[PDB]
Amino acid sequence: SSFHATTIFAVQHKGRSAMSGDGQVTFGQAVVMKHTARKVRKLFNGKVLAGFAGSVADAFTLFEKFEAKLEEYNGNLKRAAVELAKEWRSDKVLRKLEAMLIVMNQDTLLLVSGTGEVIEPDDGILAIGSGGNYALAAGRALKKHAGESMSASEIARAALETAGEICVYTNDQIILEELE
Amino acid sequence: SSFHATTIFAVQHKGRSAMSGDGQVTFGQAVVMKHTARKVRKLFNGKVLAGFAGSVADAFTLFEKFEAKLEEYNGNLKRAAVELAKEWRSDKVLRKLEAMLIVMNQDTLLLVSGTGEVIEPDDGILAIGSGGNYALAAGRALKKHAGESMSASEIARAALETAGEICVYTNDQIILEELE
Amino acid sequence: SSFHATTIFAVQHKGRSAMSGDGQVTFGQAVVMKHTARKVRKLFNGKVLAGFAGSVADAFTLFEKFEAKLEEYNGNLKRAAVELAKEWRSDKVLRKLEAMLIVMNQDTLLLVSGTGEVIEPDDGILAIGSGGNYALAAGRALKKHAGESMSASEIARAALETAGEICVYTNDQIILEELE
Amino acid sequence: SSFHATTIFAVQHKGRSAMSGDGQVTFGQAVVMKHTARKVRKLFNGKVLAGFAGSVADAFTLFEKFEAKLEEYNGNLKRAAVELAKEWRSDKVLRKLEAMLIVMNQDTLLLVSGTGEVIEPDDGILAIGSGGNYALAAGRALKKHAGESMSASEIARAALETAGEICVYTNDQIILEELE
Amino acid sequence: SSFHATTIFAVQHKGRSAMSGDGQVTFGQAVVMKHTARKVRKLFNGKVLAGFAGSVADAFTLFEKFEAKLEEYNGNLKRAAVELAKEWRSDKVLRKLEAMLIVMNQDTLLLVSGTGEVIEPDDGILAIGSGGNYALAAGRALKKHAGESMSASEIARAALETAGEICVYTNDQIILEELE
Amino acid sequence: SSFHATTIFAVQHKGRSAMSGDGQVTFGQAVVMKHTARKVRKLFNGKVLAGFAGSVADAFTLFEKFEAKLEEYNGNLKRAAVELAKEWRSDKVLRKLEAMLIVMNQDTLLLVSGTGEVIEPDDGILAIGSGGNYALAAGRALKKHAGESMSASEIARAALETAGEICVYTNDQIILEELE
Amino acid sequence: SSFHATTIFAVQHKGRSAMSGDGQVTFGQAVVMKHTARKVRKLFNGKVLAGFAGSVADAFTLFEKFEAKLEEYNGNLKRAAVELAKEWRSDKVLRKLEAMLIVMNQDTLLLVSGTGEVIEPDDGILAIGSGGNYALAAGRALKKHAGESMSASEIARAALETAGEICVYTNDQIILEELE
Amino acid sequence: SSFHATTIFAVQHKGRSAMSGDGQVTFGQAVVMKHTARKVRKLFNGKVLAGFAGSVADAFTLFEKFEAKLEEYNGNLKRAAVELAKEWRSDKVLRKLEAMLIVMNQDTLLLVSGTGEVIEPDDGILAIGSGGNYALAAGRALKKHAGESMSASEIARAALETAGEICVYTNDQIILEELE
Amino acid sequence: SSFHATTIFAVQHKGRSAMSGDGQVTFGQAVVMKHTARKVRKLFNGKVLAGFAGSVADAFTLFEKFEAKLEEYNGNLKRAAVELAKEWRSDKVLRKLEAMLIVMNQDTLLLVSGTGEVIEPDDGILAIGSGGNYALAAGRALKKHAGESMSASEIARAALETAGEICVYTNDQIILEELE
Amino acid sequence: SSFHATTIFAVQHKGRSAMSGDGQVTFGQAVVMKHTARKVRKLFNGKVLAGFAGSVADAFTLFEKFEAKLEEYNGNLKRAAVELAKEWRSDKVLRKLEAMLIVMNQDTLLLVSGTGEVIEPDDGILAIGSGGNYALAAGRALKKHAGESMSASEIARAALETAGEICVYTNDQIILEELE
């Protein structure tokens, strides 16, 4: 009866920062409208990666508000994040949104929700959307037991692939974006 | 207890753009009020096809808003679409609408929802309403295995016919509209 | 726990236009407050028949708004109908109303709902209210297999009688109104 | 979990007009807070009887509005009634009220609801509240088979008594009011 | 989704014993299959009246069992009743039955249920089925305020008539049976 | 999630006895597996017509049991019917069946249910299944206002056609059987 | 939809043992079939008082089983009680019974349930049925603040009266039984 | 999942007016945050006692509004009460409040609710909150069978104690306040 | 919380008989345990194709029972089918099974269910399982508008592929089996 | 589907005031996003400790409002608390918040909720959040049976540790803050 949230995985590993995401539009219990979609975008002069699951409109709206808040607080992800969280909460139109937002720059990773949450993984990894948990497990596993061997981009790629292979709401049309 | 959404199929094939739709008003689990209905209309100087399932009033309201947004952004389907999506979302009166909207012009196909979704089929086909999935499967099948043989208008016609034959909420009173 | 909608049947047959309706007030699962009621009224200088099931207040309000819209668009049932539908929808107080409205003039029959629906039976018959389906079936049957033998008024009479005999929420206190 | 509606019976018989009502406050499935209550009051210079079941506040508010509407339309019960019905409906605060209102004067009896209903018993009797049906049956029975023997006041008295004896939400603390 | 229980009223008044019952088969929320039905029968050599609402099969089964138990305990209504009650309870196939049974002879009135209830009205009146409450109120009312004027048969007739006029599940096809 | 019951109409008119039925297998809210089906069969040496909606297996089982009971009681529809009803009830495997059974011979029409019901229409018509009410209304209407003009077979034909035209679960693949 | 459990209060005070109970048969949310009923009975040679709420049949069955178990264990209330509890539990027909049983003799008070409970009030008072809590509070209150002034029989009388005055399912037709 | 309403008991007896209340904060099905609480306060120059169960904030708000309304209508409890009831109702923020309010002065006792109820016990006693019924029964019992022996303050004390001993949501930390 | 039924498509086209099926084990809302599975098997000496969705055990049990029934009735698919249906029904262990069975030989196609259904598509195509409807629409479409161009095996292949592409519970690990 | 509230324990013991809290972010029935979190903060010039469970945004908002209210009423925890409670209530955006707030200074402990509650533990201990009850029990236990041996900080530490070991929503990443 509703569209399923895309799966987005974000990891920071060895100075590199990558963020992957699948592209599968699923409306209803099992109907697939399309595949190759793009909710992982670059913001603040390609200085930050932002991923929002589901709703291109809501994605846009949020990207913009964060983009703005980013300038208002001079690229300080932390502040921009908490401020966006405050608005998120009081918007009472977006407050409703179940989907969550991931923002990260060269220094830190952050998870933001409409409930006013702003979480920073002490793990260096974040994932959200249908099948985010699967990706999270895969990512955490690969980073801990094969980090020195694979890069952030590679991990992000693998994490999503693993999720797509297990979750019926995640496919192989992966989109990767990274900050140098 | 409510009226069933009509079935609308839209396909772009070999430079041609057709959009079909059945006409069956079904109120309640199985009552049929009438047949031959028309929710597939031409907008922006017959330059775009817009189909909205169910509610002639809501259909009108939405057609108009998109018509307007279309001019405000100079016939740019993409922008007009996402803007409409934003309003759709915040209208909180239309936001409620379960039905979805399909808009397409000579270049691209788009699906818009009150949840703020704006999806573009990488497949060239979209379908919505009671029995949209059946139409979608038929359309995709015919286009992939008989495209070079049948046109967009012909496919749109067949897709709907197939849906009407399987879905108890879809009939044979098909309405076809196309952009040259 | 609520009042049951009266049953109204409207038919156009052989140049004549008749509209019947029972009169039974049923509050709750089975309590009958009274019988002989009147929700089938003549509007626009006896040039149109309007029937609204349940709520004399809501009936009045709607009759008036259509009466008005009728003049604003110079007796054009079609336009007046769709405009009334638009208001119906946005009233968000009447929007709630489950009952539906039937309007017809010397030329055409129309069904209007608070969800913004405006349906025109390609069959020449419409029916609404508790037991409308029974009336609809009886009407359609009589018109198709005994039309040349019985008039529109006669059919409307029979359709309602048949519904009253089957539906525990429809009685024999029938009210008939017709346009010459 | 809520207060049960008192039982009110109104009857017009042989030029006399009486209206009775029990007085039992029942909060919850079976708790009794008190008995002897009074929701049957005289309005418009003792020229009309009005009974509203449950909520002394809502009772007051409605009595007043009708009192007013009564003057605005010069004691015309019918108009005052339908107007009150229209407000009732649109108040969307009272619209919620499940309880119903009975109004009657020397000439006619009327039932008004928050759903915009205005019913006039062709029987000369109306009853509402917890156990109104029982009262209704008793009243109808006594009037039809013992009318010439007992008066309107007497019937109203008996109808309520019978309801109190059967309904666990109706007691013997009956209140009777009548118009000469 | 199920058949509605017929309405049966039994009254003992001034040495006479009458038992009436309507005849209306209602399947589902409002469908009427037929009218004139007969679930009020004479047993034990026309010495007792037994009425069971709904299911001609279950009616038969129960009439028989009581007929039997009646002989086993030599026409002692009381014992036969309680014994039937015990079986009723343990049958766990009839135990399910929602309908209730009324049995009466020249001396006393009794109500029996599948839950093992055996009630004797200290009032001289019993009623069961869709609309039994209405009949009960009417009967009690007529007997108390017009007893000396109308007989048991007459009351039984009126009580049912009153119930039929109010309950959408009770009609005027009344069946009366009485013991001299 | 389940298969929809076929629609069966049975009518006795002017010494003739006809029984029609559509053939549409609908599994789930709107999926159609096939059409032309046959649940209306002749029993007891073409002396009786039996129609059971849905489940060819259950249909068979029941037809057989009635066939048997028919012989055991020497073609006495009435007894065979009530006996079948008793078994129906206690089978507690068939007791579950929602579908109903219609049996009729040269003299009478009967409706049997797993709840132990055995109804005889004082009207001469019976209908059951998805859309049975529509058929019922149509049949009753045609018989009352066009009986002398059309036969039992013709009516049965029309009643079903009308139901198929309104009910999304009834089609035009009608099957007619009649006793001379 | 079911019969309400009568209210039974049992108290042991100053060497005396009394047990009261109201008599009100309430079927459904508010229908009263009769009053003066008797579920408080003397067992084991007037040596024990047993009260069971609702179902005269179930009452009987249980009284008997306890009577028996009482002899099998030589009037040892305690053992007979626990044994009855064990059967109660495994009967899986009575196990279903919601009503509870109270048994007391010259020495102790006991509460038994179909769930296998056997409670002995360290307070000297027990109450069960619709409105048992009210009686319990009244009893406890009177015994603690007016014991030395009123007897066990008097208290039992008062406790029930108080319950009847508050609970719509408890009346004043009190039945008192006591062991010397 | 929510805080349980404290228990408040108010009684007027022999010219004295006392109001007790327990102090037990229970959040959730069984968690106790604290005990000794105070929702029974003196208003209007210690001339009136007001008790509101649960929410110190809502308690305050309401006490103030009544305090005010009290002055606006010159200490007339009755008017102040009904006016507060009207506001209560329309506040649609407090209207939500499930808790009820008790107000009393030297002359009368009154119960007020957010549904617009204003009840005056013809009994001289009122109780509200978790376990108010228990207190009510105890109070009514003690007043009727030991009034001449114990005072209003003493009864109020006892009523609450009895409630605390039975209700798991009422304790022994009783607070008593009285008007001379 | 349960395993999703595989998707099976069976079609008879131009003397050839093919039956495809995907292989995707999905436990729970979206977990995939494996892919390449095989529930489409050859029976009765490769003379018949049988496909059962979900449960290899139940699949086996049913294949065997039909295999047996096949011999008992000398390869008569029709009889074997209906007999299997009867057992299916009465097994009351398999009767529970939601999944359905498809059986076909050189001459006809058949669908069997635990509810005792035995359907024969007058269309020459059958489909069952998660996404069977999608396959059904695709198959019907391709056979009607490209039959003469593609074979039964080819259609079966396409139908499943189309279903896999739309249904999140259907994959590309297709298994095809056909009778020469 | 939502984030679980962190667990916070606050205790005042022997002139010292400590407040601990775990740090575990759990989204959904069992997903853990991170651990080491901080919702226990120092306010009013390290003169007061404030802990709010869940939502860093809501935490901030509330801390600030209390901080402010604290100055407006000159560090009077009591007043600032009740005032905050009043706003909390009327915010109707925060009013929604299920989480609760704990505030304490050198003199007293206070619990505040969006329902307008302001509780002061007469026990000297407060606890909130997922697993607050476990912490509460542990704290109360240790303080009563080992107070003179362990300090407030130590107890707070232990209480949380105990909760973390039992509650699946509480971990060992404890945060402790105390006022000298």
Place this chain on the structure above:
Amino acid sequence: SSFHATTIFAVQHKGRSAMSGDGQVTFGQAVVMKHTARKVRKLFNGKVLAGFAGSVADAFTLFEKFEAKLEEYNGNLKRAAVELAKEWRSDKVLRKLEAMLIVMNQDTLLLVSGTGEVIEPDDGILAIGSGGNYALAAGRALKKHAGESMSASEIARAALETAGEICVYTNDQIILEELE
């Protein structure tokens, strides 16, 4: 309200076969009874590894039955598996069991369920229990991107560790068993 299933992971990698499992008993939404548990056991002369989540009793029963079936079919995992599946299904006492069973020997891995499922991962990995999906993702990830580097035992260890770190129902008390 019930005990959570332990998490078991089984993997076959590079000729080695390992099976890990956590040990955490969680009763209810969040209560932990203990940790270090053992449901991963060696069977058939340490020739096979069997893991069953939750219920030591059910675990035992199943291990034994498979042990037996293993001998009856001479260590043929495949057959023993399917046979166990058949019994599993028909046990209708174990059939109820939600938990699943994993069995593996030197050659193959198998998953068995009470629904009669017998799945063989074409992937070489299987996982079940609370948090089995997390383990599954981690296992699949590690095996695909770090297989040649870590052994089956090592992977099994990591997969569980990863699951324990994310799932609130999985801990670090891991148990590993392997076949040489």
